[PDB]
Scaffold this active site. Structure first.
Site: not given
Length: 708
Positions: A423, A444, A456, A494
């Protein structure tokens, strides 16, 4: 060509209507088929020797998938959408008005207008196959059942029970549908039509009885008291942001309290006006975008073999990956973790997830034990030489990850994909020392893995096109909605969430209470407030990416000075350890969520609370919207379709707004530029409209070309 509705009349004086639409794999029940049914119904009353008629799907996967939503999208005004509902209500009435018995032989998905067609029938028999589902999901699109569903369903299964199906749009399996009375009998698919013709021979169907809970509320007082109770319970959930909720309770009520023609008038009126609401246009935009995501293969290359996958790293994260790849994708998975407790957690994870399904739902514990045969855990190197893909879920350290790449490159086959769950680390640095870097990719996931449908996929500069296409195929098999984002810091989800979280923490330092901030953005549309969101994910978890984002972009991602270090220095890591923000030591089952009053002394509080709830949500949302436009401008996301999907499913962006880009086009580009220019004047340059957005505001540009 062969018609969508084919009729052949048996010699036992019953007829069978075969519903085979040659256009798509699902019977989409287009409005054009109205004349095809109207030409058949006249041939049914042609001879009086007939005793019944049977509707059968003749398609393997579904009965009727529901009304074609492209009909609604082409309606120019509410009066045209009202006509489509009335034309649908007119057909269901003529099928129901036949003197012979009409019965639906259901196999597969029976949703939307498909269930409204079955409700118009006098009897129903469905298959016990897990694909057979019954429901009215028109309200996930911002609409309501427009072919009499709001009227026939309460008259059949129960008013309070029909409200749950119409308000939530949930699907019902054959077991639950038989108990509620929605289907008269369930029958294996081999003798479905044989069982359907038997029900057609009978003169009268069962005069169905009402459940006691529904007879309890019978009467004017109980009916008015139920709607007031349901009206308050749905107002809490929807926060008043969904107009369909309010019109459903209206249409269902008046139909019970007024003439049969009036309730159908109220339904078609509510259907047409709901079709023009911006909420429905936004909800249908998510339906189109989700459909386009499933069709998108990520790449034109043929996918690699995907018969066996392994995952590096156990724990609750690894167990969630092993669960979705074995319980949803059906691929056998093996877990490698040098820590034995990490293996135990990952194995006990999938056991807890299936034992919940053994408790009062799918059950079939024999299948539960048969399902866990696909997962296995070890601390050694055995059972990995032929894995087709490896999902690394180990500590977020660059040196450790590229060491895992070398292990996969020597202990696995030459074609195995290395999919990183990283991440905060770039994919290019992980594949820097890889002998075959074209097979290294980012995959992800979001915790909890079972509750988060978005993933992701981050390919680095040297990732092969075949690797991309294989990873997305795996993500779809795992029941995930994937978006392919570029290899930049924070990816997309994020990245656009950090200033959103930072601003909520910023107002905590400026005197705003925790309850006021979270309730403000829940009212805006988010499922959970930002303060409670940082807690469910973990304090250190949701804030560990902040340093990387500051080092790559600047001070806009900067958090309040020392409050992040002050909370983690007090052993407050969120709901994981039950300390910080909201206190989680409460004993009440439905105990009201209360904040820990000690979080305010820890934080550098300076203020008394002088910011209204719309300002609170505005400061948080405008900082997220600015990051979303920067991602689509830097080509971080492939298109605004992935940007809206990535935010609705990733960070819980309010679906009635259609995503961050549908929301900006809703307000207008230049209008949100003036909003953020104002916030930047009184709060700071972090609210400055991004470089791309002022260009769209100066012109007449929109994110989605076909405007409305």
């Amino acid at each position: 060509m062969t018609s969508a509705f084919t009729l052949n009349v048996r010699l036992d004086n019953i007829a069978v209507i075969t519903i085979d639409v040659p256009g798509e794999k699902m019977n989409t029940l287009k409005a054009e088929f109205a004349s095809q049914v109207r030409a058949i119904i006249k041939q049914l009353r042609e001879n009086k020797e007939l005793r019944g008629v049977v509707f059968v799907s003749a398609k393997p996967d579904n009965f009727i998938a529901g009304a074609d939503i492209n009909m609604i999208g082409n309606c120019k005004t509410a009066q045209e959408a009202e006509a489509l509902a009335r034309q649908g209500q007119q057909l269901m009435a003529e099928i129901h008005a036949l003197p012979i018995q009409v019965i639906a032989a259901i196999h597969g998905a029976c949703l939307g207008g498909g269930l409204e067609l079955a409700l118009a029938c006098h009897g129903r028999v469905c298959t016990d196959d897990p694909k057979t589902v019954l429901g009215l999901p028109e309200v996930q699109l911002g609409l309501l059942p427009g072919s009499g569903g709001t009227q026939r369903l309460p008259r059949l299964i129960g008013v309070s029970t029909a409200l749950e199906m119409i308000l939530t749009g949930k699907q019902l399996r054959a077991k639950q549908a038989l108990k509620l009375g929605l289907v008269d009998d369930v029958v294996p698919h081999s003798i479905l039509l044989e069982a359907a013709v038997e029900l057609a021979k009978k003169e009268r169907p069962s005069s169905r009885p009402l459940p006691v809970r529904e007879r309890i509320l019978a009467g004017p007082l109980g009916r008015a008291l139920l709607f007031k109770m349901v009206g308050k319970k749905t107002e809490h959930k929807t926060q008043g942001n969904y107009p369909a909720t309010e019109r459903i309770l209206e249409v269902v009520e008046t139909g019970l309290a007024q003439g049969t023609s009036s309730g159908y008038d109220a339904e078609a009126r509510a259907f047409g006006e709901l079709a023009m609401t911006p909420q429905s246009q936004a909800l249908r935009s998510i339906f189109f975008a989700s459909t386009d995501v499933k069709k998108d293969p990520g790449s034109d290359a043929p996918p690699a073999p995907l018969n066996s996958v392994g995952i590096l790293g156990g724990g609750l994260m690894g167990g969630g990956i092993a669960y979705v790849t074995a319980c949803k994708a059906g691929i056998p998975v093996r877990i490698k973790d040098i820590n034995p407790q990490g293996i135990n957690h990952a194995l006990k994870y999938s056991w807890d997830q299936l034992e919940g399904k053994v408790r009062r739902r799918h059950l079939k514990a024999s299948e539960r034990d048969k399902q866990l045969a696909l997962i296995s855990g070890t601390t050694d190197y055995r059972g990995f030489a032929h894995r087709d893909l490896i999902i690394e879920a180990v500590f977020e350290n660059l040196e450790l990850k590229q060491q895992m790449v070398a292990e996969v490159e020597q202990n696995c086959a030459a074609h195995t994909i290395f999919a990183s769950n990283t991440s905060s680390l770039p994919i290019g640095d992980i594949a820097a020392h890889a002998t075959r870097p074209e097979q290294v990719i980012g995959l992800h996931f979001f915790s909890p893995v079972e509750k988060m449908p978005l993933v992701e996929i981050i390919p680095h500069a040297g990732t092969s096109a075949q690797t991309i296409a294989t990873t997305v195929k795996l993500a779809k098999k795992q029941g995930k909605t994937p978006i392919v984002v570029r290899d930049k810091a924070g990816f997309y989800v994020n990245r656009i969430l950090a200033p959103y979280i930072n601003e909520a923490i910023r107002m905590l330092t400026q005197g705003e209470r925790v309850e006021h901030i979270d309730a403000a953005l829940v009212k805006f549309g988010f499922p959970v407030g930002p303060i409670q969101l940082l807690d469910e994910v973990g304090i250190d978890t949701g804030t560990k990416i902040i340093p990387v984002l500051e080092a790559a972009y600047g001070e806009r991602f900067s958090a309040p000075a020392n409050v992040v270090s002050s909370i983690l220095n007090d052993d407050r890591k969120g709901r994981k350890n039950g300390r910080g923000f909201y206190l989680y030591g409460q004993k009440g089952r439905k105990s009201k969520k209360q904040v820990d009053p000690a979080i305010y002394p820890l934080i550098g509080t300076q203020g008394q609370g002088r910011i209204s709830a719309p300002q609170v949500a505005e400061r948080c949302v405008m900082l997220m919207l600015n990051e979303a436009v920067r991602c689509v401008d830097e080509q971080v996301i492939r298109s605004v379709r992935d940007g809206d999907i990535g935010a609705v499913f990733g960070i819980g962006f309010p679906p009635f707004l259609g995503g961050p880009f549908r929301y900006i086009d809703s307000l207008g580009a230049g209008e949100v530029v003036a909003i953020m220019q104002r916030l930047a004047t009184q709060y700071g340059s972090r609210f400055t409209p991004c470089e791309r957005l002022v260009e769209m505001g100066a012109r007449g540009e929109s994110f989605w070309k076909t405007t409305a």
